[PDB]
Amino acid sequence: TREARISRAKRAFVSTPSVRKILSYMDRCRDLSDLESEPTCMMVYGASGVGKTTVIKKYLNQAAAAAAAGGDIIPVLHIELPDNAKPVDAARELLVEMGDPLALYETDLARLTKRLTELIPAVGVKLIIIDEFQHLVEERSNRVLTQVGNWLKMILNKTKCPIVIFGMPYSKVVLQANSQLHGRFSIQVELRPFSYQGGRGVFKTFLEYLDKALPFEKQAGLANESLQKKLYAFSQGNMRSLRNLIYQASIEAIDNQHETITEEDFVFASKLTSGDKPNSWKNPFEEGVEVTEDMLRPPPKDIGWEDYLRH
Amino acid sequence: TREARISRAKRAFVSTPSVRKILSYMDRCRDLSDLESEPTCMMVYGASGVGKTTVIKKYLNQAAAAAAAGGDIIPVLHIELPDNAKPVDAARELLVEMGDPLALYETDLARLTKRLTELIPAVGVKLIIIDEFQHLVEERSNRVLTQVGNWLKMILNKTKCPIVIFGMPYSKVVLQANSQLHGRFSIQVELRPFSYQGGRGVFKTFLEYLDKALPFEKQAGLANESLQKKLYAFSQGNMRSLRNLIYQASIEAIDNQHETITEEDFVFASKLTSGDKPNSWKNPFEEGVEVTEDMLRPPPKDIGWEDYLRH
Amino acid sequence: TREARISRAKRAFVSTPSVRKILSYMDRCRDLSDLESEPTCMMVYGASGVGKTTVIKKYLNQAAAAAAAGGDIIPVLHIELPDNAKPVDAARELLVEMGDPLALYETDLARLTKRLTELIPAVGVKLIIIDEFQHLVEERSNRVLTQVGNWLKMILNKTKCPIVIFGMPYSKVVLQANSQLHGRFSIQVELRPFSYQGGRGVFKTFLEYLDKALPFEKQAGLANESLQKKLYAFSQGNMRSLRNLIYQASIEAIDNQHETITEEDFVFASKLTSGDKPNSWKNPFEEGVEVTEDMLRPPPKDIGWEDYLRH
DNA sequence: CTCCAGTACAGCGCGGCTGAA
DNA sequence: TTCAGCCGCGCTGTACTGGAG
Ligand SMILES: Nc1ncnc2c1ncn2[C@@H]1O[C@H](COP(=O)(O)OP(=O)(O)OP(=O)(O)O)[C@@H](O)[C@H]1O
Ligand SMILES: Nc1ncnc2c1ncn2[C@@H]1O[C@H](COP(=O)(O)OP(=O)(O)OP(=O)(O)O)[C@@H](O)[C@H]1O
Ligand SMILES: Nc1ncnc2c1ncn2[C@@H]1O[C@H](COP(=O)(O)OP(=O)(O)OP(=O)(O)O)[C@@H](O)[C@H]1O
């Protein structure tokens, strides 16, 4: 097996120009705030499985690894809101993640607001990264509860510290709900999936560098005329479903001692990771699926909106 | 009586290729997660009485018997959600099943989420098997309450541990409810009942190996021209109703000292376990039920959907 | 008076072949479950006043009298659900009936589920007999609330103990409501009333053995040409209305010192217990009610359904 | 004892069915 | 076909109950 080789296939990061744009703007957002005047506050959108959590994890490592190794400083944070969050819930989650208070027994919303304003300049917080902002949309109704948003404005004005709120595209309406919170978050970037297959696009060079990064020694056959077309046909732009297929195909080619990833175990990987794919979608690998013009259209505008459009 | 022989007739496991497919994928799901990166997360559908709980019990024994005998390690779990589950309810059920906390007095959903994230790497959890996923569908309305699904996504991202959620086929819409939870559960397998009678199929060899496994010494007469047609006519594919009929017929042949299972006590067993069978269905054993072409059609597509279609 | 003789007239049990069928199946249901594998789980239907409660009381005495006299063991139970039962209500009723916990102050549905799963193998429960299953049908609307049914499935799978749920025939739709609970209850028997008067049927020999069992010394005159026709004409099959008439007639013949039950006090007993009988029904005892062909028809199919058909 | 959340009952508004013009 | 009245369903407000501070 060699679980070292398996972990190498699973942990494969390839930097796209969109990710380098987000990382450059994140470094800019941090280094601009003097923690006296109002910070910059970016909002990053992005659909279900574009690689937002990978972007935050890549930034976390490249920013706070040596500083966290130095001592209890924790310069940048990573916060994942709970579903249907109250201000007290997201406040105490921000508290128990940041350093080591108890913080989650005494829930009174005011004294723990005083605690984390006492503690944010104490440890030396430089940035707050919130991952889930679509949790502030109520599930079955379409009201967006503005208590956490107003509390985020409150904690932003009280202690001037830049906040980079991530979320799905339909979380925009939560920023539309509060006009003051809308005005604060000026910088808005859309981390949207891969666009076209025509070739010599960002998708080809991405698969070229991922072909390089794969733990096979000789070639993996990606980013050619035939296989790129089949690959985009399987996974439209969704980075997770593409990486899942590539991961299952790699560990399949590792299991039965092979040269590389071939059109032997790729078909098996396609039939394995095609459960989540929609009703009308066709698997382009099986017996005789001539990959069509209609399969390779760019992803829509409302790609991450559909759950909001379902009600 | 010899309750040893009765327990032998009751505890009879025959491995079908569909069950071996599920077990191979379950072993694969476990041995792929390094518990740093995102796990694989299979979803196994299956109708009312296909042998899902038998699959989980067979896997539990063949995985965790010697490791549980070694000490308090509990590598794999078995969770059965309560009906109309809240995240706190399914969270504390996951807690009180896993090891020995108290965990079911202090219900605050946040500190017991912290407790089970503290405790999951502590004991060394390798896999979580959830049995009931159709409970998240509300009974009389058709809304699917997405609090437990969003909490399952939360606990999946917080502590990277593979979850194999079992459920009835109409629990698919609960996975369709959350687009992120849909994306996560890529591997989907359908454990569907037995297909055809025409003979030399999986049903014949299944009854051949179950004929072997029965505690009678000489023959039980199963998987021949006549009796296989009558057996499929009684129980379409439903593994439980077939096994119940075979069980009641076996213990009937054990009661009055007999050679084997014959067409003496099988008729009695048919009239015994025909209460649950639908209105238009005919018992093929009684006096003169010429077994027809129309009785031996394969089971439908929406076999485990009917309760969802009833409202 | 001699209240000994009065109690002898009131407490008269005559075993029919349908009752002996139910008792043989109950003994079978108990002695088959090894409390490791899935139990047998019979469902027994029956109209208003067929003698279900008498069957459970007869079984309770003949099973658990000496074992309850030995010590706190309580092998078999007797549960009567409350009307519009919640799982917590029927759960704590099951708890406070079984042994001696407190169990009915702390209502949280999860920890008392843990309590009775802790306690069922502790005392040594071999069988659970639930008497009222038609309470899960809502009164004025026709929805059947499936929380107690899903909890019964939960407690059946958690602690493998055979459950014999009794109820009225229109409670079948509650078993039709849950396809998993339908599957589980394979053995379904219909304890339906007495059928015909033509003579030399089960009704004649039943009145013959009840004539024997009555506390009069010489004869009671039952199960002859004339009186059997008048008896069926009064009470179609309803065991309770028949036994009530016989009871009132007996204690009338005991009051004024008489030879036996004659056509003197039987007429008075008929006019006494004819309040519940329907509008078009005629009392066949009064002055000149020539007992007709149209009176002596067998009871209908939907005998215990009428309250469901009323809405 | 007070505040927040969930459940049940009552009132108001909207949609569907029935009766009248 | 349109308007009005009655019934059913959904939303809102109100009171009662349970949990939490
Ligand atoms: N640049 C990249 N190169 C290779 N793989 C990548 C890259 N970016 C993301 N991935 C992979 O894409 C997958 C998506 O995971 P990730 O959680 O980051 O997506 P996400 O959008 O945050 O998901 P969600 O919206 O559900 O939180 C991961 O398996 C990750 O390894
Ligand atoms: N491979 C097998 N060989 C023999 N008997 C089997 C096999 N698989 C399942 N059974 C039998 O099928 C019956 C169904 O049990 P099980 O509870 O596993 O089904 P299920 O589909 O999980 O039911 P439910 O979905 O209601 O929980 C059991 O009596 C079991 O012994
Ligand atoms: N075999 C029998 N011989 C004589 N009397 C009988 C017999 N079976 C039942 N009875 C009498 O029939 C009457 C019916 O009472 P019982 O409560 O058993 O009926 P039931 O169907 O349970 O009523 P319910 O459905 O309302 O609970 C009792 O008075 C009982 O003594």
DSSP-assigned letters across all residues of C254-276: HHTT-SS--TTTHHHHHHHS-SS
* A177 CA to E11 C1' distance (Å): 22
Which amino acid, residue B71? G
**What are the counts of helices (DSSP H) followed by strands (DSSP E) for chain A?**
13, 4
Compute how many other C-beta atoms are within 10 angstroms of the C-beta atom of residue A112: 21
Round to whole Å and give the CA distance between C19 and A144. 62
Residues in chain A whose C lies over 2.5 Å from the next residue's N (breaks after): none
Q: Which of A62, A166, A239, A276 to mutate to test the pocket of ligand 1 (most atoms within 8 A of CB)?
A: A239
Q: Which residue has the tokens 């309560």?
A: B82
Answer whether any strand E atom is within 7 A of the Cβ of A107: yes
Round to whole Å and give the CA distance between B254 and B261. 9
Query: Which uninterrupted H or E stretch holds B187?
Result: strand B187-191
* C140 CA to D17 C1' distance (Å): 20
Chain A CB contacts of B158 below 8 Å: 80
CB A133 within 8 A of CB A165: yes
Chain B CB contacts of A240 below 8 Å: 183
- Nearest-atom index, ligand 1, CA of A191: 21
C52 lines ligand 3 (CB under 6 A): yes
Round to whole Å and give the CA distance between A212 and A222. 10
**How far does chain A reach from its first CA to its final CA, in angstroms?**
47
CB C142 within 8 A of CB C22: no
- Please answer yes or no on whether B37 and A7 come within 8 Å at the CB atom: yes
- Please answer yes or no on whether B241 and C183 come within 8 Å at the CB atom: yes
Round to whole Å and give the CA distance between A173 and B196. 53
**DSSP output for A26-51:** HHHHHHH--SSS----EEEE--TTSS
CB B152 within 8 A of CB A207: no
**What are the tokens at C245?**
């008439």
Q: Which residues pair with B43 in a beta bridge?
A: B165, B188
* Interstrand relation of B128-130 and B163-166 (parallel, antiparallel or unpaired): parallel
H-type alpha helices, A77-129: 87-97, 111-123
By C-alpha distance, which of A7, C196, A271 is closest to B160? A7
With 0-12 / 13-18 / 19 or more C-beta atoms within 10 angstroms meaning exposed / middle / buried, residue A2 is exposed
Round to whole Å and give the CA distance between A182 and A179. 5
Query: Which uninterrupted H or E stretch holds B248?
Result: helix B239-255
Round to whole Å and give the CA distance between A269 and A9. 14
Q: Which residues pair with B187 in a beta bridge?
A: B42
**Closest approach of chain B CAs to the CA of A58, in angstroms?**
13
CB A156 within 8 A of CB A41: yes
With 0-12 / 13-18 / 19 or more C-beta atoms within 10 angstroms meaning exposed / middle / buried, residue B212 is exposed
Q: Cα of C48 to ligand 3 centre, how many Å? A: 9
**Closest approach of chain A CAs to the CA of B108, in angstroms?**
10
**Strand E bases contacted by the protein (CB, 7 Å):** 19-21
- Nearest-atom index, ligand 2, CA of B239: 12
**Closest approach of chain B CAs to the CA of C262, in angstroms?**
44
Query: Which uninterrupted H or E stretch holds B179?
Result: helix B179-184
Residues in chain B: 311
By C-alpha distance, which of A85, A84, A68, A204 is closest to A123? A68
Method in brief: cryo-EM
CB C235 within 8 A of CB C245: yes
By C-alpha distance, which of A232, A234, A229 is closest to A282? A234
Q: Which residue has the tokens 């025959």?
A: B14
**What are the tokens at A78?**
């990573």
Tell me the CA distances in angstroms from B249 to A27, B8, B244, B254, C305, one per residue in order.
Answer: 74, 14, 8, 9, 33
Q: What is B17-191's CATH topology? A: Rossmann fold (3.40.50)
Q: At a CB cut-off of 8 Å and minimum separation 6, what does A94 contact? A: A77, A79, A116, A128
Residue ranges around ligand 2 (CB below 6 Å): B 12-14, 16, 19, 46, 48-54, 239-240, 243; C 38, 180, 183
* C166 CA to E14 C1' distance (Å): 42
Round to whole Å and give the CA distance between A52 and A66. 23
CB A221 within 8 A of CB A259: no
Round to whole Å and give the CA distance between B83 and B171. 13
Q: At a CB cut-off of 8 Å and minimum separation 6, what does C28 contact? A: C40
Tell me the CA distances in angstroms from C275 to B117, C281, C299, one per residue in order.
Answer: 67, 11, 20
The dihedral formed by the CA atoms of C20, C26, C27 and C33, expressed in degrees to the nearest 10: 160
Compute how many other C-beta atoms are within 10 angstroms of the C-beta atom of residue C17: 10
Answer whether any strand E atom is within 7 A of the Cβ of B111: no
Query: Which uninterrupted H or E stretch holds B5?
Result: helix B3-10
Round to whole Å and give the CA distance between A30 and A14. 23
Q: Which nucleotide is nearest to A141 (CA to C1')?
A: E11
Question: What are the backbone dihedrals phi and psi of residue A44, each rounded to the nearest 5 degrees, phi first?
Answer: -110, 115
Question: What are the backbone dihedrals phi and psi of residue B29, each rounded to the nearest 5 degrees, phi first?
Answer: -55, -45
**Closest approach of chain B CAs to the CA of C72, in angstroms?**
26
* A46 CA to D14 C1' distance (Å): 38
Compute how many other C-beta atoms are within 10 angstroms of the C-beta atom of residue C96: 12
Query: Which uninterrupted H or E stretch holds C163?
Result: strand C163-166
Q: Cα of C182 to ligand 2 centre, how many Å? A: 15
H-type alpha helices, chain C: 3-10, 17-32, 52-70, 87-97, 111-123, 147-158, 172-177, 179-184, 202-213, 225-234, 239-255, 266-272, 306-309
Residues in chain A: 311
- Please answer yes or no on whether A11 and B37 come within 8 Å at the CB atom: yes
- Nearest-atom index, ligand 1, CA of B183: 26
By C-alpha distance, which of A85, A80, A79, A78 is closest to A136? A85
Resolution of this model in Å is 3.4
Which amino acid, residue A243? R
Residues in chain C: 311
